[PDB]
Design an enzyme around this catalytic site. Structure first.
Site, mmCIF file in Angstrom:
data_model
loop_
_atom_site.group_PDB
_atom_site.id
_atom_site.type_symbol
_atom_site.label_atom_id
_atom_site.label_comp_id
_atom_site.label_asym_id
_atom_site.label_seq_id
_atom_site.Cartn_x
_atom_site.Cartn_y
_atom_site.Cartn_z
ATOM 1 N N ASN A 107 0.538 2.350 -3.434
ATOM 2 C CA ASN A 107 0.323 3.636 -2.751
ATOM 3 C C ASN A 107 -0.519 4.590 -3.577
ATOM 4 O O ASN A 107 -0.727 5.746 -3.205
ATOM 5 C CB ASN A 107 1.654 4.275 -2.386
ATOM 6 N N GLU B 16 -2.107 -2.553 9.034
ATOM 7 C CA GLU B 16 -3.456 -2.954 8.597
ATOM 8 C C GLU B 16 -4.473 -1.792 8.407
ATOM 9 O O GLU B 16 -4.431 -0.797 9.147
ATOM 10 C CB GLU B 16 -4.020 -4.018 9.556
ATOM 11 N N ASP C 204 0.410 6.577 1.650
ATOM 12 C CA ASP C 204 1.618 6.115 2.344
ATOM 13 C C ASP C 204 2.749 7.149 2.339
ATOM 14 O O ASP C 204 3.744 7.028 1.608
ATOM 15 C CB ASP C 204 2.056 4.679 1.979
ATOM 16 N N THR D 13 33.644 30.626 4.775
ATOM 17 C CA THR D 13 34.866 30.377 4.016
ATOM 18 C C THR D 13 35.252 28.906 4.221
ATOM 19 O O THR D 13 35.431 28.459 5.361
ATOM 20 C CB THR D 13 35.984 31.414 4.315
ATOM 21 N N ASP E 279 8.480 7.075 -1.747
ATOM 22 C CA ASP E 279 8.045 5.685 -1.812
ATOM 23 C C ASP E 279 6.835 5.471 -2.768
ATOM 24 O O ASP E 279 5.917 4.709 -2.437
ATOM 25 C CB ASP E 279 7.801 5.134 -0.388
ATOM 26 N N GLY F 36 -7.197 -4.655 4.283
ATOM 27 C CA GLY F 36 -5.833 -5.104 4.017
ATOM 28 C C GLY F 36 -5.067 -5.467 5.275
ATOM 29 O O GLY F 36 -4.710 -6.629 5.484
ATOM 30 N N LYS G 150 4.681 3.861 -5.467
ATOM 31 C CA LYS G 150 4.499 2.508 -5.994
ATOM 32 C C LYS G 150 2.999 2.310 -6.298
ATOM 33 O O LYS G 150 2.172 2.948 -5.641
ATOM 34 C CB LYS G 150 4.899 1.453 -4.930
ATOM 35 N N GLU H 172 -12.870 3.566 -2.809
ATOM 36 C CA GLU H 172 -13.577 2.348 -3.141
ATOM 37 C C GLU H 172 -13.046 1.464 -4.290
ATOM 38 O O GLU H 172 -13.446 0.306 -4.389
ATOM 39 C CB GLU H 172 -15.090 2.563 -3.124
ATOM 40 N N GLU I 49 -6.273 -0.258 -4.252
ATOM 41 C CA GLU I 49 -4.907 0.021 -4.709
ATOM 42 C C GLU I 49 -4.847 -0.052 -6.232
ATOM 43 O O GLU I 49 -5.654 -0.764 -6.837
ATOM 44 C CB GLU I 49 -3.929 -1.051 -4.177
HETATM 45 C C1 LIG Z 1 -17.983 -0.776 0.655
HETATM 46 O O1 LIG Z 1 -16.695 -0.973 1.244
HETATM 47 C C2 LIG Z 1 -15.595 -1.014 0.418
HETATM 48 C C3 LIG Z 1 -15.564 -0.862 -0.964
HETATM 49 C C4 LIG Z 1 -14.348 -0.872 -1.627
HETATM 50 C C5 LIG Z 1 -13.153 -1.025 -0.938
HETATM 51 C C6 LIG Z 1 -11.831 -0.979 -1.664
HETATM 52 N N1 LIG Z 1 -10.847 -0.116 -1.024
HETATM 53 C C7 LIG Z 1 -9.743 -0.585 -0.428
HETATM 54 O O2 LIG Z 1 -9.397 -1.763 -0.514
HETATM 55 C C8 LIG Z 1 -8.936 0.399 0.368
HETATM 56 C C9 LIG Z 1 -7.816 -0.059 1.071
HETATM 57 C C10 LIG Z 1 -7.019 0.805 1.764
HETATM 58 C C11 LIG Z 1 -7.310 2.185 1.789
HETATM 59 N N2 LIG Z 1 -6.481 3.050 2.451
HETATM 60 C C12 LIG Z 1 -6.810 4.330 2.404
HETATM 61 C C13 LIG Z 1 -7.933 4.793 1.725
HETATM 62 N N3 LIG Z 1 -8.754 3.989 1.071
HETATM 63 C C14 LIG Z 1 -8.445 2.653 1.098
HETATM 64 C C15 LIG Z 1 -9.259 1.739 0.391
HETATM 65 C C16 LIG Z 1 -13.205 -1.201 0.437
HETATM 66 C C17 LIG Z 1 -14.411 -1.199 1.116
#
Ligand SMILES: COc1ccc(CNC(=O)c2ccc3nccnc3c2)cc1
Ligand SMILES: COc1ccc(CNC(=O)c2ccc3nccnc3c2)cc1
Lengths: 286, 286
Positions: A125, A19, A141, A160, A120, A17, A122, A78, A81
């Protein structure tokens, strides 16, 4: 480039994402997510709160790097979001909503139990375990999170109020319900997942967004909500309450009929064991 | 006993009153007050804010000791607390009120100009220069002081309040008027000095103290107030305002007719030079 210290422990790879990049821990050859919060105060607190927290629906910090930019080693989700699962009016199945929301309610309850207001919450997150519909969800987050401690109001109250301002005495009424902001956020997350659309939107509406939220008058399309249960909308209604003192608590929502579902709760415990079993150490038998 | 480091610089003597003892600086053979805040967080901030502040009506920190108990070296106020001058219905002369209050208004204005809310203004925190009726007054006890900075609300407002709680949007109205608590305190200090009695008291009254303050309905004894001017009571009235947004500001009070007194302002500048002249360095002539 990446600091020498980060490079010694991990193999940085493709962006996922502030970053997020996928990386591989050298010791373990295991996939990890490394969050880059560029350079700053809330990152110190974020790490601090995270190290302390310990729940299956709250993200775990693995390691941390102080450099030109901050680096946070986090367990890889994996499924990505929750947002990616709700965009473009993509509506989740009601049981898939129940399963996720329950986990959100547990996570948030723990946060509140431990004197932490996320502030926050959402779909952006809420992270999903696997690419499976039924999976574990983790709250991420923690940048905007507040800690509770002894209020400056509590200390003021011991004395007081001879010279004390009226508005302060007035504040005592509404005091200590800040956490109810998370219950509203939860209410807005739950409304989204069920319908596919947001409750308070600026799309095809003459009324201001601030007005919608302050009035608590959410956009209601029955054609869309006919599909959803009576119990599910009653919970949204109970959470999307204007008076924070009157709003549902994480406990109250957890008690609610919608969540009193044994097949759902079973699925969650069954998901927990599936994750937990790999890291499980032999236990001392009776 | 007193730390070795404090002892090297100063000769600790008789108590003046968190205890305050008179001490003598060894280098200068000069009288100083040393405040003992026993062991803790607000002391670090207190020192920090004090080091930064620089005004004739705000107390100056000279040195500071971190030990088993905190030690704060402060300039000695030989007239003591303002409280000792108002107890037992002791009423100050109106000009003596004008002179002191003006200084309080200046001090507090500077505090507010510099993003500092004192939060605990009382006669017990207003110190007098000499044992003279006409003297300089200095604001002390910065323990409860707040700093202003970038609000977490300001940051929240930058985003789209899709998931934002109503009560937060509601808070935006009353937001950024915390300082007006000092103006109320000032109003209560000014009411005391003039009359000899407190505006909101629990003495010979059926109504609750909280109610008095919230109603803004101060105890008014005309027999006592007949002695006081029309301009002086109008200012108290203008400050003892329930709505913080409607209350007088330090600037507004400074502008008020009561304070538009040239003989008073003259006396103050004449007091300033008297203090300042001793520490005065020769200036470069035109
Ligand atoms: C095999 O490699 C992948 C397989 C699936 C993904 C999808 N995950 C994600 O897109 C992702 C993004 C931000 C994150 N921030 C904190 C913890 N986990 C996170 C996972 C990302 C990599
Ligand atoms: C000659 O020795 C003295 C003469 C007059 C006094 C009266 N002053 C005080 O009582 C006093 C008390 C606390 C304080 N805290 C900070 C600064 N100044 C202070 C002065 C105290 C000592």
């Amino acid at each position: 480039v990446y600091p020498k210290a980060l490079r010694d422990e991990y193999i940085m790879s493709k962006t996922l994402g502030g970053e997020v990049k996928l990386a591989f821990e050298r010791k373990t050859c295991k996939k990890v997510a490394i969050k880059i919060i560029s350079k700053a105060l809330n990152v110190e607190t974020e790490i601090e709160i995270l190290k302390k927290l310990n729940h299956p629906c709250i993200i775990k910090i693995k390691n941390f790097f102080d450099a030109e930019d901050y680096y946070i080693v986090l367990e890889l989700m994996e499924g990505g979001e929750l947002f990616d699962k709700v965009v473009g009016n993509k509506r989740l199945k009601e049981a898939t909503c129940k399963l996720y929301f329950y986990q959100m309610l547990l996570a948030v309850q723990y946060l509140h139990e431990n004197g932490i207001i996320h502030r926050d919450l959402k779909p952006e997150n809420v992270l999903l375990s696997s690419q499976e519909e039924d999976c574990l969800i983790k709250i991420t987050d923690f940048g905007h999170s507040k800690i509770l401690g002894e209020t400056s109001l509590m200390r003021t109250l011991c004395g007081t109020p001879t010279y004390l301002a009226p508005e302060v005495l007035v504040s005592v009424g509404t005091a200590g319900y800040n956490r109810a902001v998370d219950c509203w956020s939860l209410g807005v997350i739950l409304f989204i997942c069920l319908s596919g659309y947001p409750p308070f939107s600026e799309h095809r509406t003459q009324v201001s967004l601030k007005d919608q939220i302050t009035s608590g008058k959410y956009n209601f399309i029955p054609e869309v909500w006919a599909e959803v249960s009576e119990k599910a909308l009653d919970l949204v209604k109970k959470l999307l309450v204007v008076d924070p003192k009157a709003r549902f608590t994480t406990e109250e929502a957890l008690r609610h009929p919608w969540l009193q579902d044994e097949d759902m709760k079973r699925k969650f415990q069954d998901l927990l064991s599936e994750e937990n079993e790999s890291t499980a150490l032999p236990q001392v038998l009776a």
